[PDB]
Amino acid sequence: AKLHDYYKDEVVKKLMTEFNYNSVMQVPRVEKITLNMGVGEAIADKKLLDNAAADLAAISGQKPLITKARKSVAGFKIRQGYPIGCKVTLRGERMWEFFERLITIAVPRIRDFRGLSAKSFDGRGNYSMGVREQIIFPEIDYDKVDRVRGLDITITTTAKSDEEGRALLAAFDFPFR
Template sequence: MSFQEVWEKEPMKKPRIQKVTVNFGVGEAGDRLTIGAKVIETLTGQAPVRTLAKQTNPAFGIRKKLPIGLKVTLRGKNAEEFLENAFVAFKVSGKVLYASSFDKVGNFSFGVPEHIDFPGQKYDPTVGIYGMDICVTFEKPGYRVKSRKLKRSHIPAKHLVKKEEAIEYIEKKFGAEVVME
C-alpha cells in the first residue's frame, strides 16, 4: 500500500509543511546586508530578521554580535507558494535534490545559488547575486501535543514523518525529482 492510499484512508497521517526557513548568509554588515534584505523581502513577501555572528573572526573582519545574515520563516500558504518558486529556481540552476538531503524525520534542506533563478527576478548590477539555503520542516496533524502548554505529551514514533513519506509528498505536491543515491 503506497503512502498516497494511506493518506486518503487516514488523513491524520498525511504530512504537511510546518515551516520553510530561508537563510541568506551575506557574511558582512552594511550595504550588502540592506540590499539582501530587500531581495529576500521581494522573494518571500516578509521582512527578514538579521542573524548575528556568534564568534569573532579577524581574518574575515567579523566581530561577535555583528549582523552578517538574514532569515525568514514562512508558514502555511506562503511557505507552499515560496517552495513552488524555489523548486523552479532549483531546476533552472541545474541542481538535483538527493535523498540524502532528507533526515530521518523527513525534514530536508537545499540551496539555490542565485536569486535571479527565481521566476520574475532579473539581474541588476547594483544588487548583485545572492544565494540562499532553504530548510523545510514537516509535521503531521496532532503535532501540537508536544508544544502546547497544558498536558504536553510526546509524539509516538509511528506518528512521526518518515523520510520516504516526505520524499513522496514533495514529488507529488511540487513535482520535484528526488534522486536516490
C-alpha cells in the same frame, strides 16, 4: 489556499494510498519554509546585507529577520552580536504562494540541472539545502541584481523520518536525482 486545496485533494490521496496510513493526518504536513542568506561576507560591507534582505522581502511576502553572531572564534576574527545574514520564515498563504511560484518555473530553469538530492536530510525529514545564482528566481531582475549570491532553502515538516520527505518529493514528482 490555491495550492493548499490541490495538495489536500491529490497529494494526500496518493500518499495515503502508497503508505496505507490509517489516521487521516498520518500523511506528512508542512510546518513552514525557511529562506536564509548566510554569505558571511557581511563583515566586508553592511549595505549588501540590507540589499539582500530587501530582495528577500520583495520575492517573499515578509521581510526576513536578521541573525546575529553565535560564538566568536579568535582565528576567524568574528565578534558577538554582529549581524551577518537574515532569514525569511514563510508560513501561511505567503509560503503557499511563494512555493507554488517557485516550483512552477524557477526549478526547471536552472543551468547544469543534474536534479535535486533525496538522500540529503537532517535526520527527521527536514530537507535543508543551499543553492547559488539567485538570478534563477524571476523577481530578481537585472535592474536590482547586485552580485551572484547564495541562499539556503529548508522545508520544515511535521514528519519525523526521511521516508516522509521521500514521499513528499514523489508527490512533487521529483524530476530526477
